């Protein structure tokens, strides 16, 4: 009914297929805090990856509440309120999850996700080293104690702007972790419930013009957990840096042809750039002479880092970067891991530059099998629309697509 497992006995990456009314346990359905808020109940879906299906009022102080205040815009302050919107929700991310992971590029993705431990530089003390809070979060136990778990990544709802996806992370008061190979825990606000549309022109009657396509969430999910990807390994561009409005970061992770525009000259400036912050991190563990908040050793942590980062070790234990690893994990986060990349594997229709999207909002429901697959999305093989991306066709497809308005 779902179609969670199409392949094999169980799901390849998602842990377990969660309910949302499933009690909590402390160990992977869990009340938690992000480090004044309610505790929330969330999901772990795989190690270091949170699911918390609520709206985002937690996220940024200056965006506490759901109602209306560029181009496209959708609100709904009801949306995600009631438990069986938050059990669909669950049961969306997972399927997005499984179906990213379906493919060579989203199995490479996930892993390196899963290893981008946030560095663990928040010591004052230059030789200590030690976890920063707020790459962690706080796990309410069924009896009401609780403990600090290191994650990753958490999925959560949208804030007040439901279309507005993002990968957001906490600031530190000196570092740039997303910018100084350390890296920091990635809050992506994401729906599966909605999506947009872009207009395609498709070759053959020759009286067809252009046709109205929705995006397949599974590409919007890849673009963000490719974004996660950059920050949790702390070489994200520079926002600063655009086209004008576009960023050099957003033309990255899209990929393709837009990629091209970041002139290589720019590109090598900031390799070096991150070969540099990276060279920092292999003499600060080199430095380390101690490690506080953990009954791990020193010897151990340092080790997860060299894991992380594919660091060189001597016979004496000194850490360096190796040139050709730091190339092939800064080329696999930035070159292989793009949009574009995505939507050749899934073999969907897209829009074919990053801001080439229609101001069109649709109300999608993926979680029956009926409606999208782990292989297919939309475009079910065996039917009318798995030719000429149907599926993907809002007018086509129409049952699966209800336009909304339109703020
Ligand atoms: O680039 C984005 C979001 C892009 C986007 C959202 C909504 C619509 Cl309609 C178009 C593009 N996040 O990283
Ligand atoms: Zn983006």
């Not at 899209?254 to 090598?268: M, P, R, V, W, Y």
Request: aromatic residues 14%; neutral net charge.
């Amino acid at each position: 009914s779902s179609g969670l497992v199409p392949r094999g006995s169980h799901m390849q990456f998602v842990n377990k297929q969660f309910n949302y009314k499933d009690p909590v346990n402390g160990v992977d359905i869990a009340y938690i805090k992000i480090p004044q808020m309610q505790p929330v109940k969330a999901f772990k879906i795989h190690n270091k990856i949170w699911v918390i299906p609520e709206r985002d009022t937690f996220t940024n102080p200056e965006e506490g509440d759901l109602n209306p205040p560029v181009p496209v815009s959708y609100y709904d302050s009801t949306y995600l309120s009631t438990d069986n919107e938050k059990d669909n929700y669950l049961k969306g991310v997972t399927k997005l999850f499984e179906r990213i992971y379906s493919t060579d590029l989203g199995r490479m993705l996930l892993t390196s996700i899963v290893r981008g431990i946030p560095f663990w530089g928040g010591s004052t003390i230059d030789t200590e080293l030690k976890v920063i809070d707020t790459n962690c979060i706080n796990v309410i136990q069924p009896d009401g104690s609780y403990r600090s778990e290191e994650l990753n990544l958490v999925i959560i709802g949208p804030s007040a702007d439901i279309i507005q996806f993002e990968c957001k992370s906490f600031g530190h008061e000196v570092l740039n972790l997303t910018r100084n190979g350390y890296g920091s825990t990635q809050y992506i606000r994401f729906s599966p419930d909605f999506t947009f549309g872009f207009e395609e022109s498709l070759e053959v009657n020759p009286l067809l013009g252009a046709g109205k396509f929705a995006t397949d969430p599974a590409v919007t999910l890849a673009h963000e957990l490719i974004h996660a990807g950059h920050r949790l390994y702390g070489i994200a561009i520079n926002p600063n840096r655009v086209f004008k409005e576009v960023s050099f970061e957003e033309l990255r992770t899209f990929g393709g042809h837009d990629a091209k525009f970041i002139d290589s000259l720019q590109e090598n400036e900031f390799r070096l750039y991150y070969y540099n912050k990276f060279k920092d991190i292999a003499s600060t563990l080199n430095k380390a002479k101690s490690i506080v908040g953990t009954t791990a050793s020193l010897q151990y942590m340092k080790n997860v880092f060299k894991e992380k980062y594919l660091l060189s070790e001597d016979t004496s234990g000194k850490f360096s970067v190796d040139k050709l690893k730091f190339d092939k994990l800064y080329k696999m986060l930035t070159e292989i891991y793009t949009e574009d990349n995505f939507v050749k594997f899934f073999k969907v229709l897209n829009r074919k530059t990053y801001l080439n999207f229609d101001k069109a909002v649709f109300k999608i429901n993926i979680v029956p099998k009926v409606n999208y697959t782990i292989y297919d999305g939309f475009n079910l093989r065996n039917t009318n629309l798995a030719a000429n991306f149907n599926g993907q066709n809002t007018e086509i497809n129409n049952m699966n697509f209800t336009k909304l308005k339109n703020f």
